[PDB]
Enzyme design. Structure first.
Site, PDB file in Angstrom:
ATOM      1  N   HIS A 184      22.837  -9.168  34.975  1.00 51.70           N
ATOM      2  CA  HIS A 184      23.810  -8.923  36.047  1.00 51.70           C
ATOM      3  C   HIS A 184      23.341  -7.943  37.128  1.00 51.70           C
ATOM      4  O   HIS A 184      24.140  -7.512  37.953  1.00 51.70           O
ATOM      5  CB  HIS A 184      25.150  -8.471  35.448  1.00 51.70           C
ATOM      6  CG  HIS A 184      25.603  -9.280  34.271  1.00 51.70           C
ATOM      7  ND1 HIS A 184      25.264  -8.966  32.971  1.00 51.70           N
ATOM      8  CD2 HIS A 184      26.361 -10.399  34.197  1.00 51.70           C
ATOM      9  CE1 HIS A 184      25.792  -9.856  32.150  1.00 51.70           C
ATOM     10  NE2 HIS A 184      26.484 -10.725  32.865  1.00 51.70           N
ATOM     11  N   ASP A 225      -8.384   8.077   2.746  1.00 55.19           N
ATOM     12  CA  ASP A 225      -9.096   7.158   1.896  1.00 55.19           C
ATOM     13  C   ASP A 225     -10.576   7.056   2.268  1.00 55.19           C
ATOM     14  O   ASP A 225     -10.973   6.169   2.943  1.00 55.19           O
ATOM     15  CB  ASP A 225      -8.419   5.797   1.907  1.00 55.19           C
ATOM     16  CG  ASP A 225      -8.917   4.866   0.805  1.00 55.19           C
ATOM     17  OD1 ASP A 225     -10.001   5.067   0.314  1.00 55.19           O
ATOM     18  OD2 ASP A 225      -8.248   3.893   0.548  1.00 55.19           O
ATOM     19  N   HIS A 262     -12.750   4.203  -0.344  1.00 56.24           N
ATOM     20  CA  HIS A 262     -12.899   2.761  -0.130  1.00 56.24           C
ATOM     21  C   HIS A 262     -14.106   2.409   0.733  1.00 56.24           C
ATOM     22  O   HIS A 262     -14.580   1.271   0.686  1.00 56.24           O
ATOM     23  CB  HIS A 262     -11.605   2.164   0.481  1.00 56.24           C
ATOM     24  CG  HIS A 262     -11.512   2.266   1.976  1.00 56.24           C
ATOM     25  ND1 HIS A 262     -11.308   3.458   2.642  1.00 56.24           N
ATOM     26  CD2 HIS A 262     -11.576   1.310   2.934  1.00 56.24           C
ATOM     27  CE1 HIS A 262     -11.264   3.226   3.944  1.00 56.24           C
ATOM     28  NE2 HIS A 262     -11.437   1.932   4.144  1.00 56.24           N
ATOM     29  N   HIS A 320     -16.154  -1.585   3.065  1.00 55.06           N
ATOM     30  CA  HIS A 320     -16.924  -1.772   4.297  1.00 55.06           C
ATOM     31  C   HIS A 320     -18.412  -1.989   4.049  1.00 55.06           C
ATOM     32  O   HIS A 320     -19.209  -1.872   4.965  1.00 55.06           O
ATOM     33  CB  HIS A 320     -16.666  -0.613   5.273  1.00 55.06           C
ATOM     34  CG  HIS A 320     -15.241  -0.526   5.728  1.00 55.06           C
ATOM     35  ND1 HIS A 320     -14.663  -1.483   6.536  1.00 55.06           N
ATOM     36  CD2 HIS A 320     -14.281   0.405   5.499  1.00 55.06           C
ATOM     37  CE1 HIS A 320     -13.400  -1.162   6.757  1.00 55.06           C
ATOM     38  NE2 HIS A 320     -13.147  -0.013   6.156  1.00 55.06           N
ATOM     39  N   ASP A 346     -10.634  -4.537   5.884  1.00 61.56           N
ATOM     40  CA  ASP A 346      -9.464  -3.907   5.262  1.00 61.56           C
ATOM     41  C   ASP A 346      -8.299  -4.874   5.079  1.00 61.56           C
ATOM     42  O   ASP A 346      -7.372  -4.551   4.340  1.00 61.56           O
ATOM     43  CB  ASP A 346      -8.973  -2.754   6.128  1.00 61.56           C
ATOM     44  CG  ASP A 346      -9.883  -1.553   6.094  1.00 61.56           C
ATOM     45  OD1 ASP A 346     -10.057  -0.964   5.006  1.00 61.56           O
ATOM     46  OD2 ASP A 346     -10.344  -1.164   7.182  1.00 61.56           O
TER      47      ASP A 346
HETATM   48  C1  LIG Z   1     -10.129   5.719   6.430  1.00 54.36           C
HETATM   49  C2  LIG Z   1     -10.227   4.599   7.226  1.00 54.36           C
HETATM   50  C3  LIG Z   1     -11.408   4.327   7.847  1.00 54.36           C
HETATM   51  C4  LIG Z   1     -12.485   5.160   7.663  1.00 54.36           C
HETATM   52  C5  LIG Z   1     -13.675   4.875   8.276  1.00 54.36           C
HETATM   53  C6  LIG Z   1     -14.742   5.705   8.144  1.00 54.36           C
HETATM   54  C7  LIG Z   1     -15.913   5.394   8.760  1.00 54.36           C
HETATM   55  C8  LIG Z   1     -17.024   6.188   8.611  1.00 54.36           C
HETATM   56  C9  LIG Z   1     -16.955   7.305   7.813  1.00 54.36           C
HETATM   57  C10 LIG Z   1     -15.767   7.603   7.194  1.00 54.36           C
HETATM   58  C11 LIG Z   1     -14.657   6.815   7.362  1.00 54.36           C
HETATM   59  C12 LIG Z   1     -13.476   7.099   6.719  1.00 54.36           C
HETATM   60  C13 LIG Z   1     -12.393   6.275   6.877  1.00 54.36           C
HETATM   61  C14 LIG Z   1     -11.216   6.529   6.245  1.00 54.36           C
HETATM   62  S1  FES Z   2      23.374  -5.965  33.944  1.00 54.62           S
HETATM   63 FE1  FES Z   2      24.533  -7.033  32.442  1.00 54.62          FE
HETATM   64  S2  FES Z   2      23.254  -6.995  30.618  1.00 54.62           S
HETATM   65 FE2  FES Z   2      22.180  -5.813  32.117  1.00 54.62          FE
HETATM   66 FE   LIG Z   3     -11.253   0.689   5.876  1.00 56.41          FE
END
Ligand SMILES: c1ccc2cc3ccccc3cc2c1
Ligand code: FES
Ligand SMILES: [Fe+3]
Ligand SMILES: c1ccc2cc3ccccc3cc2c1
Ligand SMILES: c1ccc2cc3ccccc3cc2c1
Ligand code: FES
Ligand code: FES
Ligand SMILES: [Fe+3]
Ligand SMILES: [Fe+3]
Lengths: 446, 192, 446, 192, 192, 446
Positions: A104, A205, A208, A213, A362
């Site tokens: 509107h 983390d 992992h 990786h 991941d």
């Molecule tokens: C969490 C998610 C990604 C990550 C990636 C990394 C890459 C290189 C070194 C450490 C890292 C730690 C990480 C931790």
């Molecule tokens: S002007 Fe009516 S919904 Fe936005």
């Molecule tokens: Fe990762």
């Protein structure tokens, strides 16, 4: 479920019920006790530098308009017309003095005010109280060195206090480097994971990395590449882990300034970071200058994560218990040469963007861990985060927060989930504070 | 095209149209079709090394962008309009290929299934570089994995191909402006 | 809904509320009182014959790894890592001594034990109690002549007792034939039906065959083809129907050894079955030798169905109230020539597989009947299963179970749904037993 | 292709590539395109008897498999790798056609709607049988029924076609390895 | 086709088959392919005025129907079998084009993204009008907008094209019988 | 949510909680208190004129068969077999004396009676009480000048009484014109909007036309085209708005007989309507003859809308809170030349059909307004419908109902939502009546 009484996270954060990654009722409850309560990443100064510049952002499942005001401040409003509820702005970024609704034709200022209503005189006369019909405003909007966060809850701590012991670790890169810029626009991809799965992974983390990786480490060139396939454990003193009262936390991998970047960027980066560190030694001291050029994998509670030095900046935007919209930006240091910034930005997306080959490693991990939380025999099972428990400290003379003085552990998970549980079982900030008055003691038991 | 009259048409798109309307050579279109069908076949069977060796030039730029959604009337906001999902030289493509082939790429077990559908092929020699072939084509790319995961990608490709080692035409530039802003395919880890 | 009191199935199983095929809360409740409580089909010896062989299978919505141990036994475990809940195995079948998690590299034995943890010494020291971190094991795993079933509930009856009066009918084909093999891999197709729709159809539904399958009967060649378009009613004494205490049941169509197979297989099959029956007369008696070569349409409660002689073997894997993942294997007699086995396997898939032309006839019937259970005016409507009521017997001198001595009726529906209702309203096996102490009397009333 | 280097490529897939890279004949590709377009048209309009008469050889094997998901490193487990969704001779195809045409096929009322998209056609004569034509092509098959049911199928087809009655080329083998393990299309009751 | 034997085939569909089986001209198929690829390219870049000027004849009928679902055996009920989603003359198409280009078409900001895939092209000259070209083709049309809206359309097109101003072949009739009865694409506001 | 107490619509209908467009529990509750209770559009005489003619229609989420009986009446039944619940009819329209179920072949009459059961004698004997097994019949089926509506609730008011003050406005076009025909088949399209979004828009929303439809107005030729982009406000006395006790309402735009039709139809239409109006002056008086040829945008509560003169006829069929299946027919005057009827029908679909360019303008408005009702910060927000409040009248000497004597306002929204709230908080028609005994007073306050 009774969230006042239900133990979703065990004492000291040692375990969590697997259902937390799958339960839609809990997801709905998080909208209230996590997302409506806490600080959420919106944008950076570098993306809305001039008056009238705006972007849209998610805050939980809500969408907001984030706008640079004439006076240099930033205000954020619900992206919802105050008349019949139509979404006001359909683009991601732009510059405007106001926003007109396509239904509107109601016109709102960049300051949220209802400024015009078509044919107001003929239709409403003097009866429409426009002063009461401004867009619903995000109560709180604060900046951490150009990084703009919002919070719907007026009672929240200031952003700085909310960062707690994590701020000390971020400051060398975020402040003492001369400042960072966010390079947009972000990549955007939906994954079939709960927002907590990537959040926990980035907060805490390191375990992992070598296994998850392995292929990216091996192929991809990078400085941390000795870890591929768990071929090598980082040496003692290779890093540490930290966590904080309000749930933010990170890993520190000493000296890893080139981060996940392939060998095409390693020499240039290691030169640039080393040079800056040499200047910073004099200003902030050797330890903090070293932190500047150390790789930090951090989650700013609840759902904003980053890898400093790698330059990866993430928002895990929640959709439902097994759906998350992943936003990926690059962070660069302002004083880097522009050509390096460009290449660094591309490398961030190359590794961790929509076609990020590291990020792809991941996917199954996050998605299956999340979806398994819906499965009947797993709902009441316990996800474990006990690695390094009983070796964490608090109040260290050099490194603040609850700290594990090892590169690989689950310290930051425990602090993340202690904060999560305290929020989910509390009705407001006062109750969270009451539930958190012995936070560090709980984390350092045994 | 007159983009002042055809208000929705970008300058870039109008330029690319002109290139194909100009001088149609049927034999070139047929050569381009063969080239692309063979490329798709190699990719579909996950012969990534063969694809590099036979289809990709040493000077390649392989680029897929995602463009930020902006107002059709926008004329003031001037920051980076797009990001690069891919912006790869030959060495970077090789890294990606090695990542695909690595036996500790856990996501590749059980083996993925790819099927590509290439359509709307147009081909035109460059006006100023007699050895540079412009090829346009659209792709539907179907990736299936893990029993019930199915991802379908849709894109228009603006390619430049040029004769290389052994006189074989190889890809020297691919540009894709990905049409979906928010991917609903888990990732974009496919070679469009 | 109060499942203790709600009458979802009327006395004697004469009717069921249509909502049972649509209600998601009831589906969730079935996960607990049907799927977590009862025996579910996993695999066959023929698919995991050697040590280290495994397959994955569904048990309700949960996924399990089913593994042949070194000592010749089979154990089954949740396909979920004991660390942070990632799905351990991403393939359907293989051979391995263990399973390594792709997230942090935890290694589990084929026996479920946590055998290795990367860098355990450096990271956990002696603090990780691996003995307590084995995969979550399926409490019960038993075999019926090579057909392997699992049950999460330690209190369940032995599989043999659970089969009750149905076992007597299955034994001539499953045991006295020399044994059956399951020919994998299965077809897998998702249909938009509740798992009970195909389950009830296979347990008990001869009535539909002439009309539903008119086109397949007419086109397709087969022995039962006089029924096409209800052109002919089978003669009196053409068959019978049976049901049992724990809900399993079947139809018996006398002599129909070639089953749904097209005329290309009819001569060969009728010869083979007749020859074996002649030998079996001497061993198990004429009636049971005749049962061997008679077509049995059976559901082993809750969600495993089969057509013996036709060789069709089904698992109706539940996803939600209107979604089921249909697994289709072929069963063959071990002593058949290999070429016949191959052709029989192909014919099973041809008729009842993913492109099974018979199976396709059933789709709309199952899907619409299920989806209609969500529709407001139908939720509280009554699905009828009264055909033949008041003519069933129990304790017959020749044919055991609750038996209707006619080829076409709804006897097996009534027993299926009596068992279903007794489970849904009970908290454990003891309560089911208490609710079932007059099961056969209830079914033979009037 | 060297499958020791291109680690993700199957022996079968590498063999099939070789066949088309070898000796390109543009006229053959165009004949193959016509053949397949006409076949798809007959199928799309549900002229199943015409399809049998005009497109399908009396010695046909029409086969669509579903392959069990196994570990990329798997080398010990050796049981049946696949099942046959279709593995039909001419008589079996005829049975299926009669089932489609039967007036008591209730699922065919209201009438179904099919649309097929055939792409990536390659054609090569067999080396050792001068009258056997190898044709590869990909299909997207869209089936719509009953107001809101929509099923889309994706596949690569490895065909052999040979001249039969009246010199008309007819399908003598079709092989499809269906890329999705768990079908999400209700069934596979379509002629790919 | 004998529609008494091929029971599922409509009279209309059998007529259209006959037209293409009759007299194949490869050069015509290739011309048709060019025509349609160029048309799709103009539409994809939203050069709607250029499409009208270069591809659409002044006497055009542009028609897309939706057919009511009726029993295969139905022989008594005789009311309107279909409705017209589109049934446009040139002026009506122009209205639609102006609506697309209007700067107060709010739904066109941010700009939409279209990608078309044209396949299964057949071409045949009319028997009785030497200047009327029959062209059949199938289209998959992908429309993406607003971050996460994705709509995919599938259709067979029965076209008539004829040489007009400057000898350029232009569309004089397009007929589409849309295969999905209940649209699940928000609308059908795309030029098929 | 407690629907007895929850204020979803504020006094006088001045506002509604935004959650009404998103909440699935409320949607389920509407199935009972809106759709199972009220009159719903089924079909027109012109679509089932002869004995045995039928169509299928939705009534809420239920599907019904609507059939012309031998005696000329129309009866409607649930499209669900009384045996095991299969959908009986899979087509949209046809002619038949009965319907046979494809599962087990049960045959029902056009009158709903169970007429045959295959092999009834051999199978059921005399035990099947077919008299009690007729299809579940829609309790109430009435006609408004050929337009056939159904209601599942036997206690509803007669259709005429239910139309209340709206009937007076519809009668000149629906009755005094000689009668209307519905031109089928309808377009059918799913939109991601709540059914109330288009319902409210058609009942009452002239305000949006100039801005929402700016491009269609400008391009498209039509009589109301001066409004494009809010370039011009209609003159005073250009129209009025009305609403009624049972929630039906409409806008009246004086003289706009060519409606949304492009200039290709304007001359012909304005001639035809003017000629008929001249004859009608003598029969029904000048005001009502003028109403005949005036553009009415009307919603017949809950979910049937129309634009008279434009000839647009809509059913907003509910699927879930953010999904609606839109059915679009054309209405024509019986005595128009057939060629005009054909062109008018095409023009209705051209503007408001599946590819209706006007209808497309409304999509984002309806969809985003609906989806925003799910968003956490908007659920408890107030949708405003206060324009013109305090200027409405009741009991006017010329124009009946609650009436705003202006072309643009929110009068009809207020009456729609007053009726909605009274239904949602009531268990039956008696309670609605009790909740509505001061309906017009509530609407005309201040
Ligand atoms: C969490 C998610 C990604 C990550 C990636 C990394 C890459 C290189 C070194 C450490 C890292 C730690 C990480 C931790
Ligand atoms: S002007 Fe009516 S919904 Fe936005
Ligand atoms: Fe990762
Ligand atoms: C249930 C499901 C399928 C059946 C298929 C049959 C085929 C031939 C003869 C009897 C059958 C009974 C059946 C019962
Ligand atoms: C609601 C929905 C559509 C409408 C369309 C209109 C077209 C012309 C003039 C008035 C209208 C009012 C309308 C009100
Ligand atoms: S989730 Fe399996 S090792 Fe961590
Ligand atoms: S479900 Fe209709 S006859 Fe059985
Ligand atoms: Fe059946
Ligand atoms: Fe509108």
């Amino acid at each position: 479920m009774n969230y006042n009484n239900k133990i979703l996270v065990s004492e000291s954060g040692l375990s969590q019920k697997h259902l937390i990654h799958g339960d839609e009722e809990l997801f709905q409850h998080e909208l209230k006790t996590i997302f409506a309560r806490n600080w959420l990443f919106l944008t950076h100064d570098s993306l809305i530098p001039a008056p009238g510049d705006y972007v849209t952002a998610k805050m939980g499942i809500d969408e907001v308009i984030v706008s640079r005001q004439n006076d240099g401040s930033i205000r954020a409003f619900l992206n919802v017309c105050r008349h019949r509820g139509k979404t006001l702005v359909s683009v991601e970024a732009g510059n405007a003095k106001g926003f007109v609704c396509s239904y509107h034709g109601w016109g709102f200022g960049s300051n949220g005010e209802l400024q015009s209503v078509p044919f107001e005189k003929d239709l409403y006369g003097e009866s429409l109280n426009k002063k009461c019909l401004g867009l619903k405003e995000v109560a709180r909007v604060e900046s951490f060195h150009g990084f703009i966060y919002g919070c719907f809850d007026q009672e929240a701590p200031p952003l700085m206090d909310y960062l707690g012991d994590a701020a000390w670790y971020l400051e060398p890169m975020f402040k003492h480097s001369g400042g960072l810029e966010l390079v947009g626009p972000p990549g955007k991809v939906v994954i079939k994971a709960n927002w907590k799965a990537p959040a926990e992974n980035f907060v805490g983390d390191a375990y992992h990395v070598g296994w998850t990786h392995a292929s990216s480490l091996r192929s991809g060139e990078s400085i941390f590449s000795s870890l591929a396939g768990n071929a090598a454990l980082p040496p003692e003193g290779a890093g540490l882990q930290m966590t904080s009262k309000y749930g933010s936390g990170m890993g520190v991998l000493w000296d890893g300034y080139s981060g996940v970047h392939s060998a095409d960027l390693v020499p240039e980066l290691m030169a640039f970071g080393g040079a800056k560190q040499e200047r910073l030694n004099k200003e902030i001291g050797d330890v903090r200058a070293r932190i500047y050029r150390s790789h930090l994998n951090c989650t700013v509670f609840p759902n904003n994560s980053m890898l400093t030095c790698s330059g990866v900046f993430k928002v895990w935007n929640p959709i439902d218990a097994n759906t998350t919209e992943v936003w990926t930006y690059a962070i660069v240091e302002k004083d880097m040469p522009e050509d390096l910034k460009r290449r660094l930005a591309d490398s961030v997306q190359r590794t961790f963007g929509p076609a990020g080959f590291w990020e792809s490693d991941d996917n199954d991990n996050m998605e299956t861990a999340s979806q398994n939380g819906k499965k009947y025999q797993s709902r009441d099972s316990d996800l474990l985060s006990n690695l390094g428990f009983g070796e964490d400290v608090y109040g260290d003379a050099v490194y603040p927060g609850v700290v594990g003085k090892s590169a690989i552990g689950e310290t930051s998970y425990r602090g993340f989930y202690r904060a999560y549980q305290a929020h989910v079982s509390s009705s407001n900030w006062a109750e969270f504070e009451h539930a958190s008055s012995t936070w560090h003691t709980e984390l350092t038991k045994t | 095209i007159n983009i002042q009259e055809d208000k929705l048409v970008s300058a870039h798109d109008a330029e690319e149209i002109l290139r194909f309307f100009n001088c149609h050579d049927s034999a070139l279109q047929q050569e381009a079709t063969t080239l692309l069908t063979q490329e798709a076949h190699l990719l579909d069977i996950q012969a990534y090394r063969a694809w590099l060796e036979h289809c990709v030039g040493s000077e390649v730029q392989y680029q897929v962008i995602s463009r930020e959604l902006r107002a059709a009337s926008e004329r003031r906001y001037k920051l980076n309009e797009a990001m690069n999902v891919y912006n790869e030289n030959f060495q970077q493509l090789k890294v990606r290929v090695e990542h695909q082939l690595d036996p500790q790429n856990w996501g590749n077990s059980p083996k993925l299934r790819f099927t590509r559908f290439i359509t709307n092929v147009q081909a035109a020699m460059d006006v100023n570089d007699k050895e540079l072939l412009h090829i346009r084509s659209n792709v539907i790319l179907h990736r299936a994995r893990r029993g019930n995961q199915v991802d379908v990608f849709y894109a228009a490709r603006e390619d430049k191909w040029k004769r290389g080692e052994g006189g074989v035409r190889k890809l020297v530039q691919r540009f894709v402006d990905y049409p979906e802003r928010i991917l609903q395919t888990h990732n974009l880890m496919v070679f469009l």
